[PDB]
Design a protein around this nucleic acid. Structure first.
Lengths: 104, 97, 78, 92, 98, 84, 105, 92
DNA sequence: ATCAATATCCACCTGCAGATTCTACCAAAAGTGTATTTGGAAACTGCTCCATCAAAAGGCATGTTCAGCTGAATTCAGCTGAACATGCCTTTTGATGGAGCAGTTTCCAAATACACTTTTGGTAGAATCTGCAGGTGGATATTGAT
DNA sequence: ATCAATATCCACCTGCAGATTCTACCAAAAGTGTATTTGGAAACTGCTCCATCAAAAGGCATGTTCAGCTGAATTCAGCTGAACATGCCTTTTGATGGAGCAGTTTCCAAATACACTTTTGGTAGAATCTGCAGGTGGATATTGAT
């Protein structure tokens, strides 16, 4: 009977609790459900990225998601883009060419 | 005899390289440079290949993004050619100063 | 050594960056900037290395360094 | 010996996209991603509890931390999932 | 009758304001602006006076700093008049949204 | 109470000119004043939204200067001189 | 009976700083006897550096008491403090500067 | 009730500028500066400990944290002052 | 916009191999069950300090007029940087085998956390000194017309 | 060049607002003990790095030619700065009531802390397979030129 299965989550509630406990503080304590909540939103967010990333790969008729697909998915979405100003190694950039630079 | 007009090939390379994701700096010259710079901080260092690879990724991601902002400054000035004052302005507004 | 970062390479980077026409002075400018970049990141990386009493800069030492300059990198251990 | 979120990322991939696989470099990205958001959420939550002279990071800290960290809409749904997973888990 | 030429009073004012440190937005209207925006988030809120003091100092710090960058963009375009597209170029490069 | 509306216009054309002067600006186009108001409003929304999130969490009805100082630190606009 | 500050030759309060380190980190977190000392030392050195330059500034304006304007002058004028302190000093103003293009030909 | 760094900032002030006072707003700034730098050190130091699977924060952590946060010349001098005070302290 | 002749680009389909995924066991978490702790929500309450209100007055915002000079448009020609097909020097790569040395592990001295009971340093208001904020008035620019 | 018209200093001046000192309890820093680890400290793995060699294969460096872009010069409509008249609304001084921080207290529901039992996730080798990168040849884009 595991806490992830109890919470109806794929993500590892037990481990997330053990990591949280190691963040704060000497004094510190960690509620039962905090681990559950955290694991819940980490799972939701990776589902959202993988959802969009999956579409990007289908729209190129390939089966395997690559870092390019993660980059296209993330940059092409206003909110994921805001949230993730990391550098996605091997993802490249979104194709874009300024109007003024096109031939007349 | 066949020639393309100035800019035509240029636009072709933009399209090609914004399409691809490989490193655009050559690995070995870059490794040489990283190691030389590092030598000034600590001597006889060794590098995980993964670490050299992270540095290059960060570097090229940084330069490419800086070229985007440099182009914007060039276009702001009714040009089409980036110049060092374009890189200078971008780095200034960025706080790298 | 910095000169080993060649012009066609800087050309390629700018092309990915959307640049159409490149002034002849951009190349020496770009190296000065890339050099300030690597110096700032590597110094911090090596500082993490020395702290860990190692002789080998790990990818984590760079990922940590990049996180400190605010250039977070996904793909190499965090 | 060195743990990862690979297993669980792949499990999530198979729900939203049973058809799809994922390359190891992409899996690396998702890892860096899950570690990063974890550390941001965790950081803000500790901070919150300290600002309020508390000691236990509860799901209340996490939730506020999510409102602060996630752009609205990503934050709405992320608040749902957490409220969901938590009520369902406290039902025995 | 005496007129300073266009721009002379302007340089006097840069010197004046760069030398001083007082808030440049009037207090009451700014307090009002804050309470209007705050209220569109959550009704029945109060404010410590120092909370509004904090918002105003940050707000003017931010705006003064943004006109410096805006001014560099205008000068880069070989102009002397700052325009909306300068403020937009500044904010794009600053990573701010839009 | 009384209804609060159009208070952004209380950031007058002379206040914006003064702020630009401290920023070293010599000449100002006539379209700057409404841009600035728009940009100030997005600034304040973001800071006040976060500040109020700190207030609600702590179950208070009063936004404190600490709520504002933490909000600004989050936004990377750290402020000195109110922090206690 | 002597205080740890005194024992380290410091003005900054070693005990208090040792007590804030315990307070904030880690979970199972341990703080060494000399982590506090080293910390009080560099907090005090930095305070000295800032107050040294601020004080010079207010002597350059023939006044006896340091104000936030002086702190701002000192920090912006020092290449390294300016880099360290990217914060907003309430009351500080800015460093007088006018680009050349703006000066009347 | 509410602690502060004021009597220490004041002490140090008298050392460098025996003639000079400090208005209370300037002291407010100074207090914000000290608490800020303290948090950055402590933060960087706890993180250092984490990356090396160590649970104690020693003067050796603090010293690296200072090399990471402080630029160039300020760092060289702060390290000397910290080293000096520690070896003075560890002289019983 | 058609005529031509380049070259580029874009499908469709193809075949191996470098990566992926699926298979099979061993430890360190993850889950249980018990026994304490404890932190933080109550439920009162003392008591800042925040929202109003009133009221007087001048520091400023508003609006208009007038024209100086700036930004935007246009033309131009010198010359800078793109395109090219040439010629060769450097990077790529792919085992090999040595080895430097991260990453274990096993071991105890030093360094840390507790813990009950000391002593003292620093905070909160009272109590006194006193810089300096701007008020005023002339000497020294600074600006702009002629 | 000189005035004429303003703006800017720069120094001098006096009590007010705000600072430097002065005075008392409380939390916290200190010196004692005793009980627990932590993370060097050595000694030895195996990874996985560096340094080779050694091709062929790119990818760069080089020089030439000129298209076309940048910068300079010229012009002018009108936008924006300066100044002025007018009067409103912010500022400032000072109260009022009381909403709602924040300081104390109790004290269960919720945690940590074991100690054991049992599971899963990580590692290291098997077992296919996605798609890189290669071919063709059809259509396109680009550029010269009745």
């Amino acid at each position: 009977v595991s806490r992830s299965q109890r919470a109806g989550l794929q993500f590892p509630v037990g481990r997330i609790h053990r990591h949280l406990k190691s963040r704060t503080t000497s004094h510190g304590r960690v509620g039962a459900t905090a681990a559950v909540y955290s694991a819940a939103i980490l799972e939701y967010l990776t589902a959202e990225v993988l959802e969009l990333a999956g579409n990007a790969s289908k729209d190129l008729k390939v089966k395997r998601i690559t870092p390019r697909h993660l980059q296209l998915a993330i940059r092409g979405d206003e909110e994921l883009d805001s949230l993730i100003k990391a550098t996605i190694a091997g993802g490249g950039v979104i194709p874009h060419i300024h109007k003024s630079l096109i031939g007349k | 005899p066949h020639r393309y007009r100035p800019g035509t090939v240029a636009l072709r390379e933009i399209r090609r390289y914004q399409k691809s994701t490989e490193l655009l700096i050559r690995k070995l010259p870059f490794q040489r440079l990283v190691r030389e710079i590092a030598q000034d901080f600590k001597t006889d260092l060794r590098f995980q290949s993964a670490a050299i690879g992270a540095l290059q990724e960060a570097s090229e991601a940084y330069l490419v993004g800086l070229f985007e902002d440099t182009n914007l400054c060039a276009i702001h000035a009714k040009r089409v050619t980036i110049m060092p004052k374009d890189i200078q302005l971008a780095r200034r507004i960025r706080g790298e100063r | 050594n910095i000169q080993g970062i060649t012009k066609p390479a800087i050309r390629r980077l700018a092309r990915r960056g959307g640049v159409k026409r490149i002034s002849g002075l951009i190349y020496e400018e770009t190296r000065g900037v890339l050099k300030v970049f690597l110096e700032n990141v590597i110094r911090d990386a090596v500082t993490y290395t020395e702290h860990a009493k190692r002789k080998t800069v790990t990818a984590m030492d760079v990922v940590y360094a990049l996180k400190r300059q605010g250039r977070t990198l996904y793909g190499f251990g965090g | 010996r060195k743990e990862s979120y690979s297993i669980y990322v792949y499990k999530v991939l198979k729900q939203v996209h049973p058809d799809t696989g994922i390359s190891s470099k992409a899996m690396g990205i998702m890892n860096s991603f899950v570690n990063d958001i974890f550390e941001r959420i965790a950081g803000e939550a500790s901070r919150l509890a300290h600002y309020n002279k508390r000691s236990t990071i509860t799901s209340r800290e996490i939730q506020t931390a999510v409102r602060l960290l996630l752009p609205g809409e990503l934050a709405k749904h992320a608040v749902s999932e957490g409220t969901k997973a938590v009520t369902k888990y406290t039902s025995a």
